[model samples]
Target: AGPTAVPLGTAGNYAILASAGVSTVPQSVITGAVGLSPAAATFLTGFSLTMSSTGTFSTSTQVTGQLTAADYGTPTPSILTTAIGDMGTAYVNAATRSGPNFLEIYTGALGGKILPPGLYKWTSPVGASADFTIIGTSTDTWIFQIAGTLGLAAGKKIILAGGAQAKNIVWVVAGAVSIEAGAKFEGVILAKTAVTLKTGSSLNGRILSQTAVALQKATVVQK
Candidate 1:
C-alpha cells in the first residue's frame, strides 16, 4: 500500500511502448497509442504514418492512437523523448521500492496458482507454461521484480481475479520479455532489453521496453 500505487505519468498514454523501436505485424489492433523514441519513424513499421502540424501522429489502420517516433523530426519526437524518460523513471521506482509483504520468492510452475497483492522478487527467469492468476481487490497492488527473462507459453493466460486491475500491476524485468503465440497477458512490463510478442498474443497492458518491442499479430489494450 503505497501512495498512488502505480504512476505511469505521461507514459500511460501509450498502450504499446518501446524506447528504441516499435515494430508490429500487419493487422495488429492497438487500442491505445503506440510510440518509440531514439528511433526513426521507419522504426514504426506495418503502417503508413501521417504527421500533424501539432506534432501528433496518425495512422489509417492498426493503432487507435498516435503513431510516433523520434525520427519524425518535429515536436512529437521531443514529447516521446520525455515520455520515454518517464518510463525509465517508473521502472527504477518499481525496482528499487522496498517494504513489508515483499516476497523474495513466488510459487513455482505458476500455473493455476492464486497470488495476492504485494511486491514479489526473483533472481532468476520467470515463465508461465500454463494459466496464472492474480487475485486481489481493485486498489491492491503487485510489483514483480525479475532479474532475468520473462517468457510465456502458447495459449496460456495470466488471469486477474476478484477486482484486480492491470494498471496496478507492475513487472520490472532485467532481461528480455517473450510472449508466445496465443498467450493472454496482463500488466505493465518494464523490460531492460527487448520484448517480443509472438503471433496471436493479446496484452491488456503496456509493454515498455528499454530496447525494442517486436510484435506479430498482437492485440494490445491500454490499462
Candidate 2:
C-alpha cells in the first residue's frame, strides 16, 4: 500500500539500460534486452557484438536478448532515446513520492527483515550485510527512495516471499549502486549514477542507470 507503482514506460523493455556506457568483464548472462543511450556500440565493451546486416542492432552470445546503442542505424537511436527518457521519468516518479511509509529504518543497514509492500525512504546509504526478504503479493508494489548509494555485501541476498515478483519493486538511488561478489538482488534499479556488479552477483530485475553500468561475470534476468 504505497503510492501507485512507478511507470517505466518504454524503459521496461530492457533488462539493462544506461545513458553513458555499459561494460562487462569477459562474459555476463543477460536474459532480457540491453540498451545504451547517448553512447555508441563501442561503449558496450567485452560483449563482442555481431552487428546486424541492417546495422540497426547487434547480438551478443552473452545476451539472450537483442542489444542496441545510440549510434546504431535509423530507428534504433530514436527508440533508445525514448527508452532513456522514460527511465529518467520513472526515476523522478519514484524519488519524488511523498509520504513514505518507512524512513531510515535500521539506520540504513537493511538486513534480516521482512519488508512489506510500501514506500520506504533512506536519507543515507543503504548497506545490506545479510539476507532481506520482500513479502507481498505479485501485484503489490514496493518503492525504495534512497538519497545515497546502495551497497550489498558479498554473498548477501534479497529474497522474495508470498508470491512477490521483482517487477513490482523499484529502487531509486541517488548515488551509485554496488552489488558485491556472489550477491543477489531483486527489483528494478533506477540509479542516478553508476551501477557496478561484482563477480557472480546476479539480479532478477532491470538495471537502469543514468551514468554507466559495469558487470563482471554476473547474471541479470529482467522481470
Every model's TM-score:
0.92, 0.98
Which window of ten consecutive residues has the lowest lDDT sum in model 1?
100-109
Specify the highest-lDDT model's number. 2
Candidate 2 Cα errors over 4 Å, as ranges = none
- After superposition on all CA atoms, what RMSD does each candidate show versus the true structure? 2.0, 0.8
Query: What are the clashing pairs of model 2?
Result: none
What C-alpha lDDT do the candidate models reach, one value each?
0.81, 0.94
* Per-residue lDDT value at 211 in model 1: 87
Q: lDDT value for candidate 2?
A: 0.94
On the 0 to 100 scale, the lDDT of residue 47 in model 1 is 68
- List, residue by residue over 125-197, the lDDT tens digit for candidate 1: 8888889899888898888888888888999999999899998899889988889999999999988799988
* Model 1 ranges off by over 4 Å: 1-4, 53-56, 99-108
Error in Å for residue 142 of model 2:
0.5
